[PDB]
Ligand binder design. Structure first.
Ligand SMILES: *[C@@H]1O[C@H](CO)[C@@H](O[C@@H]2O[C@H](CO)[C@@H](O)[C@H](O)[C@H]2NC(C)=O)[C@H](O)[C@H]1NC(C)=O
Ligand code: CA
Ligand code: CA
Length: 278
């Protein structure tokens, strides 16, 4: 009902990255101290309904619609890996291909949106993408040097805290956490700053160009490198399992070309100040 609401992320200093990297190729290390000015972050990833308001207002055609295909995980059917298929007619309204629909999942995160699509939405909304540092600071939710937004245990108190994979990937997803594919954007507990599904569910685009080479120097509101070929995405998705993936940590990070899209990748917006009410 308020799926475009923002929360205030307080000013602070935090440790970005980790000196105990789990996927070393991704440049999770070194840990570095980063200062972040107070700003606002969407509580929820952008949902199908919210994206549809944007498309209704602007007529925007997404990159996947213009290309005529997008990547779909083979386990969702009725490339980076054999389980990623380029499906003709897969896009945000048709997340598994032309015979699928979003009618029954209006409150789920929008998928098959490229980095350019995400920038278009956020700017239409009076907002912007978060930087990687803003995203990671917000993900950590006021905790220092923890694996997850909520701490170091995957299932605190025996409860699922995010939508990831259980079972044997890619053949069997048991749905133990309540969701095979995506969950509603307001599912699961919030983190300490009031964000929902910051890890898991679907990946989220950030504004930074990708590099794996980071300095240990302290920085203020860093924006990432001035050039690159891929943009950074964060958080992991409903596909992720410890056995092959382990990217549902705040420090984890991956990348895609900005015209890329997939069935497990969306976004949320940020803003320096609140945009106009309504
Ligand atoms: C986006 O626009 C469509 C088309 O105007 C909206 O769907 C219509 O909503 C009205 C109002 O309830 C109905 O009378 C029509 O039958 C709907 N048409 C179709 C084709 O669904 C839709 O609700 C808008 N989406 C958002 C999120 O506002
Ligand atoms: Ca799940
Ligand atoms: Ca997420």
């Amino acid at each position: 009902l308020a799926h475009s609401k923002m929360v205030p992320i307080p000013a602070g200093v935090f440790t970005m990255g980790t000196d105990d990297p789990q996927i070393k190729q991704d440049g999770e290390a070194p840990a570095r101290r980063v200062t972040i000015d107070a700003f606002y972050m969407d509580a929820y990833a952008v949902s199908n309904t919210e994206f549809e308001k944007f498309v209704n207002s602007t007529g925007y055609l997404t990159e996947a619609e213009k290309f005529g295909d997008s990547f779909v995980f083979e386990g969702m059917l009725s490339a980076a890996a054999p389980w990623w298929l380029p499906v003709k007619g897969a896009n945000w309204r048709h997340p598994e291909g032309p015979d699928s629909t979003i009618l029954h999942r209006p409150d789920h995160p929008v998928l098959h949106v490229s980095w350019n699509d995400a920038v278009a939405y956020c700017t239409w909304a009076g907002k912007r993408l978060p930087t990687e540092a803003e995203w990671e600071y917000s993900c950590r939710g006021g905790l220092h040097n923890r694996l997850f937004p909520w701490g170091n245990k995957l299932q605190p108190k025996g409860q699922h805290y995010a939508n990831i994979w259980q079972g044997e990937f890619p053949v069997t997803n048991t749905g133990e956490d309540g969701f095979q594919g995506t969950a509603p954007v307001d599912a699961f507990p919030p983190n300490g700053y009031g964000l929902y599904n910051i890890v898991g569910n679907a990946w989220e685009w950030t504004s930074d160009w990708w590099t794996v080479h980071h300095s240990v120097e302290e920085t203020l509101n860093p924006k990432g490198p001035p050039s690159g070929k891929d943009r950074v995405k964060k958080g992991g998705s409903y596909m992720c399992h410890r056995s092959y993936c382990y990217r549902y940590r705040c420090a984890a990070r991956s990348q895609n070309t900005p015209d890329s899209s997939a069935s497990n990748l969306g976004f949320r917006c940020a803003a320096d100040r609140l945009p106009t009410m309504d």
